[PDB]
Amino acid sequence: EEGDIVYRLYMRQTIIKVIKFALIICYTVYYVHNIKFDVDCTVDIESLTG
Amino acid sequence: PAYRILKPWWDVFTDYISIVMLMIAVFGGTLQVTQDKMICLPCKWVTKDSCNDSTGPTGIKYDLDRHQYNYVDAVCYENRLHWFAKYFPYLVLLHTLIFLACSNFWFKFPRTSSKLEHFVSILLKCFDSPWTTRALSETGVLDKKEGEQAKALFEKVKKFRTHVEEGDIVYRLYMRQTIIKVIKFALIICYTVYYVHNIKFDVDCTVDIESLTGYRTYRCAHPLATLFKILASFYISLVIFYGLICMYTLWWMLRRSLKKYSFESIREESSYSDIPDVKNDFAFMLHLIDQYDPLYSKRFAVFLSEVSENKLRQLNLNNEWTLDKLRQRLTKNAQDKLELHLFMLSGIPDTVFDLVELEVLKLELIPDVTIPPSIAQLTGLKELWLYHTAAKIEAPALAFLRENLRALHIKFTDIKEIPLWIYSLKTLEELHLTGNLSAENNRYIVIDGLRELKRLKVLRLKSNLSKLPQVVTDVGVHLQKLSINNEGTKLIVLNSLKKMVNLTELELIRCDLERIPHSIFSLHNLQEIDLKDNNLKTIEEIISFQHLHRLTCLKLWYNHIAYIPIQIGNLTNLERLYLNRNKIEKIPTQLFYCRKLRYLDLSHNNLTFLPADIGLLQNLQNLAVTANRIEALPPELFQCRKLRALHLGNNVLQSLPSRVGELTNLTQIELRGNRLECLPVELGECPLLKRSGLVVEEDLFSTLPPEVKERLWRADKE
Amino acid sequence: PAYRILKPWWDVFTDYISIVMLMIAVFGGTLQVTQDKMICLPCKWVTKDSCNDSTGPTGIKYDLD
Amino acid sequence: LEHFVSILLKCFDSPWTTRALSET
Amino acid sequence: IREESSYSDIPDVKNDFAFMLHLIDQYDPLYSKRFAVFLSEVSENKLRQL
């Protein structure tokens, strides 16, 4: 009757799951479009290849 | 098996973190193995051992074979690349392994493993017991089996406590373990953080091999540097978390000082105070189990209490003694009263009180007794004897005893064995106290409350008393018999005894009085007097006993009396007279005015002959003159027609007169210890005599006629 | 199951050491198998069966397959 | 060995032992 | 143990049964103690009486 520990932990657990969910949706969708097949890159090594 | 209970939460976190560390270790290792590449090229223009870094463009031509690139790769990988970037995952793997070894060592180490498995086995079989939950529920009738289970369990716990108390091995090893983990933590943080920045993607290396290639310097690239860098950051983060957990554990353990388990909370709460505190190597286990679940501590603590054990003893004792067994153990005593005598038990079996016919209860040397209400079943109880047994009681049983008791005997060492409630009683008729009734500067405080015992008809005290208590003479309105056995301690009477007008029998025994006091003459109702061991030499004062018309018995043995005063002839109502074991030289004839005498005992005096006046005891029935030096009996002895027993053995008789034939009612006679050669035939003339009753040596007995012996044979079985 | 009692502590340590030894054995074995390489080159100038060790630089040509 | 340890465990597990030891 | 618990009538052990006891002693002396009781003849006599 006295404890009240299980409810608190399950509460915190659910909250952590939800906030983590939101974060991963956020940055995943923000950065997903950057994947591409072809890329142009300028690396600046003249001495080794020209 | 069920060692989950041992492991605390921090141990759990350490375990899973170790698994994760091992996972990333294996991953980095296999990644290193499956590709192990570095990509090198030369540098044409050199400035300070480094690259100068100075119509479409065209590719550069170095004129090298594919295999030479691999050679220079291997060389620059071997030499100039830094060892940490090579051997990171191997080291991590090693570290994880030695963490886990430190973790599971004290389980796998046998000397402690035995103690642990034994401990937890005891704990689980204790927790599963039913009597535990009963005892806790308490805050009937039980099975024989589980009682013995519990008893065996108690002793198991006791020997186990004795066995574990000395060691202190587990605590030391756990201490060493934690310390190793912490110092190793610190070291790995140190050099890992010191060397982590050395990992780089690009490396310039000058190896000095001109002959094989003709180039001095090289620029090389290491693809996996970035990945190992992030893994190392992640690694040290996990490691930091691990070490903080270990530090918390260490701080807790060193702060708390666990060698003594305080235990005070349950004994304050549940009111089981008689449990000692715990010593080293058995407290630590309890601290751990407390960290897991406090309930098992409480469930285990119950067996440590002795009160619980005493109650369990009472329960087995109530369980064991069956009624049928007790019924056969009972005894019907000399007064035709059913009695039970018990000694040296742990308490009172409750099965006692269903023996409804019981009339006397005796308790001897039984500690911490409480009288239960079931005593109301013993409707016929009349006596209770408490020998060194203090007794508590509550009101219902108390009321039953107030209304249904006649006598109380107490044998005690001091006041602590005196129940205070006895003075609230009302139907008591006898009180018997054995022990000193007084304390320093507190004479007779123990008995101040006697006034409430308004029905006491007999008091006897054997208490080494200097004086007669005032309270006795105050209660003397209704007291009928008082008896003091003082064991030679001088008693002071001092004028109070005169108030006891109702007294009918007085015994002032072993009080070293040395003279019969004159207060006795006012006690006109006295029937019997006994003056054991008062060194009495002359008893002339008995003249004033002539007014005690019911005086029938005078008991003066083992004194120094030299002669019988003549006035004895005026005590015409005497029935019993004992003057044996004295120094008497002659018999006055005046004794034989007491013609209602039945019993006279003059054995062990200095008598030579019996006067003819012995014929005057017309009411004599039994007589002992044993162990004097009488040679022959006067004829007038046989004028006492009513004789039934004559004890004359162990004298120096030379002949037995024939007139023994006249004793019709003789059934018992002593002639043993004489130098007779035969017996007179007239012994056969006694009708009521039997073979068992003719008490004489067998060789002398054989001299009788066979016909007499046949009639004796017939007489016995009839 | 029941033979734990027979084994003393030193036997236990021997067992776990043997496990570790076998582990490193298997690892070295598979490592040898999966790459089994050595990388050789010639040496142009020889002195006592050993290398003499004697406009930008240019790569050397041995003309080998 | 298996026979020996069987004897040993059933001796340790025997009920008479705890009485025999408790008497001292 | 025979000096301590006062069961003197146990002989010393010979080869191939002593060695086992030494091993069990190295594991835990307690099993050796609990096993030692049955060797005594006093144990048999007392159980007969009981």
How would DSSP label each residue in C33-54? HH---------SSBSSSSB---
Give chains near A: 3+ CB pairs under 8 A: B
Residue B387 has a CB neighbour count (10 Å cut-off) of 17
Name the residue of chain D whose CA is nearest to B152's CA: D18
Compute CA distances B145 → B151, B311, B565, whole Å: 10, 17, 75
Question: What is the edge-to-edge ordering of all strands in the sheet holding B215-221?
Answer: B39-42, B215-221, B202-209
DSSP, res B559: S
The CA distance from B570 to B591, in Å, is 9
CA of E13, closest CA in chain D: separation in Å?
15
Give me the residues paired with residue B506 across strands: B482, B529
The CA distance from B423 to B672, in Å, is 54
The CA distance from B629 to B423, in Å, is 55
Q: How many helices (H) and strands (E) does chain D have?
A: 2, 0
Residue type at position B84: F
Name the residue of chain D whose CA is nearest to C7's CA: D1
Nearest beta carbon to residue B51 from set A47, A49, A50 = A47
Q: Do chains E and A touch (3 or more CB pairs under 8 A)?
A: no
Compute CA distances B586 → B92, B507, B566, B582, D9, whole Å: 122, 27, 11, 12, 88
Cβ neighbourhood burial of B115 (10 Å; 0-12, 13-18, 19+)? buried
Contacts of B41 in chain A (CB under 8 A): 48
Nearest beta carbon to residue E38 from set D4, D11, D24 = D11
Query: Residues B393, B374: contact at Cβ < 8 Å?
Result: no
The CA distance from B127 to B169, in Å, is 26
DSSP, res B10: H
Residue B644 has a CB neighbour count (10 Å cut-off) of 17
Nearest beta carbon to residue C59 from set B33, B62, B74 = B62
Tokens of D18: 């705890």
DSSP string, B383-448: EEEEES--EEE-HHHHHHHHHS--EEEEE-SSGGGS-GGGGG-SS--EEEEES----TT-TTGGGG
Nearest beta carbon to residue B43 from set A47, A49, A50 = A47
Instruction: Give the DSSP H or E segment for B484.
Output: strand B481-485
Give me the residues paired with residue D23 across strands: none
Q: Do chains C and E touch (3 or more CB pairs under 8 A)?
A: yes
User: Given an 8 Å threshold on Cβ–Cβ distance, is A50 in contact with B41?
Assistant: no
Q: Where on the phi/psi map is residue B156: left (φ > 0), alpha (ψ -120 to 50), or beta?
A: alpha
Q: Are strands B383-387 and B369-371 parallel, antiparallel or unpaired?
A: unpaired
The CA distance from B372 to B401, in Å, is 11
Sequence-separated (6 or more) residues with CB below 8 Å from residue B417 = B386, B388, B389, B390, B410
Mutate to test the interface with C, among B51, B61, B66, B67 (most CBs of C within 10 A): B67
CA-angle at B621, arms to B618 and B622, nearest 5°? 130
Residue type at position B136: L
Q: What does the longest C-alpha to C-alpha distance in chain C come to?
A: 82
Query: Residues B203, B81: contact at Cβ < 8 Å?
Result: yes
Q: Do chains A and D touch (3 or more CB pairs under 8 A)?
A: no
The CA distance from C42 to A30, in Å, is 56
Smallest CA-to-CA distance from B599 within B635, B553, B542, B638 is with: B553
Mutate to test the interface with C, among E23, E25, E30, E31 (most CBs of C within 10 A): E23
Contacts of D21 in chain B (CB under 8 A): 159
Q: Which approach determined this entry?
A: cryo-EM
Tokens of B276: 């000692």
Tokens of C58: 């240019």
Compute CA distances B244 → B93, B182, B392, B714, whole Å: 21, 9, 60, 108
Torsion sign (Cα): B2, B8, B9, B13: negative
Nearest beta carbon to residue B58 from set A47, A48, A50 = A50
User: Given an 8 Å threshold on Cβ–Cβ distance, is C6 in contact with D1?
Assistant: yes
User: Given an 8 Å threshold on Cβ–Cβ distance, is E37 in contact with D24?
Assistant: no
Q: Which residues of D touch B (CB under 8 A)?
A: 15, 18, 21-22
Nearest beta carbon to residue C39 from set B71, B108, B210 = B71
Smallest CA-to-CA distance from B542 within B563, B522, B570 is with: B570
Tokens of D2: 């298996």
Contacts of C5 in chain D (CB under 8 A): 5, 8
Query: Residues B286, B278: contact at Cβ < 8 Å?
Result: yes
Tell me, rounded to whole angstroms, the distance of Cα B295 from its chain centroid: 29
Tokens of B566: 């003549």
**What phi, psi does B624 have (nearest 5°)?**
-130, 125
Contacts of B159 in chain D (CB under 8 A): 21-22
Residue type at position B578: Y
Helix axes B294-301, B283-292, angle to 10 degrees: 130
Give chains near B: 3+ CB pairs under 8 A: A, C, D, E
The CA distance from B291 to B258, in Å, is 13
Query: Residues B601, B624: contact at Cβ < 8 Å?
Result: yes
User: Given an 8 Å threshold on Cβ–Cβ distance, is D8 in contact with E35?
Assistant: yes
**What phi, psi does B508 have (nearest 5°)?**
-110, 95
Compute CA distances B258 → B162, B179, B281, whole Å: 18, 17, 9
Cβ neighbourhood burial of B458 (10 Å; 0-12, 13-18, 19+)? middle
Query: Residues B217, B142: contact at Cβ < 8 Å?
Result: no
Tokens of B275: 């449990």
Q: Are strands B202-209 and B215-221 parallel, antiparallel or unpaired?
A: antiparallel
**What SS3 string covers C3-14?**
CCCCCCHHHHHH
Smallest CA-to-CA distance from B92 within B226, B233, B296, B204 is with: B233
The CA distance from B652 to B94, in Å, is 113
| b/e burial code for range B23-47 (CB count within 10 A of at least 16 → b) | ebbeebbeebeeeeebebbbbbebe
Tokens of B419: 């129940």
Give chains near D: 3+ CB pairs under 8 A: B, C, E
The CA distance from B409 to B429, in Å, is 11
Smallest CA-to-CA distance from B595 within B616, B614, B611, B577 is with: B616
Cβ neighbourhood burial of B530 (10 Å; 0-12, 13-18, 19+)? middle
**What phi, psi does B418 have (nearest 5°)?**
-105, 110
Compute CA distances B614 → B611, B635, B643, B667, whole Å: 6, 10, 12, 20
The structure tokens 């500690």 sit at B367
Contacts of B295 in chain A (CB under 8 A): none
CA of D14, closest CA in chain C: separation in Å?
17
CA of E44, closest CA in chain B: separation in Å?
22
User: Given an 8 Å threshold on Cβ–Cβ distance, is D21 in contact with B159?
Assistant: yes
Nearest beta carbon to residue C45 from set B44, B211, B216 = B211
CA of C36, closest CA in chain B: separation in Å?
12
Tokens of B34: 């499956």
Q: Do chains A and C touch (3 or more CB pairs under 8 A)?
A: no
Nearest beta carbon to residue A47 from set B53, B58, B59 = B53
CA of D3, closest CA in chain E: separation in Å?
12
Helices within B602-705 (DSSP H only):
698-701
End-to-end C-alpha distance for chain A, whole angstroms: 79
DSSP string, B113-164: HHHHHHHHHHHHHHHT-HHHHHHHHH-----HHHHHHHHHHHHHHHHHHHHH
Positions of E strands within B548-659: 553-555, 576-578, 599-601, 622-624, 645-647
CA of B369, closest CA in chain A: separation in Å?
40
Instruction: Give the DSSP H or E segment for B209.
Output: strand B202-209
Query: Residues B269, B297: contact at Cβ < 8 Å?
Result: no
CA of B118, closest CA in chain E: separation in Å?
11
> What torsion do the CA atoms of B349, B354, B357, B363 make, to the nearest 10 degrees?
20
User: Given an 8 Å threshold on Cβ–Cβ distance, is C6 in contact with E23?
Assistant: yes
- Tell me the structure's resolution in angstroms, rounded to a single decimal: 5.0
Give me the residues paired with residue B430 across strands: B407, B458
User: Given an 8 Å threshold on Cβ–Cβ distance, is B110 in contact with E30?
Assistant: no
The CA distance from B420 to B447, in Å, is 10
CA of E6, closest CA in chain B: separation in Å?
18
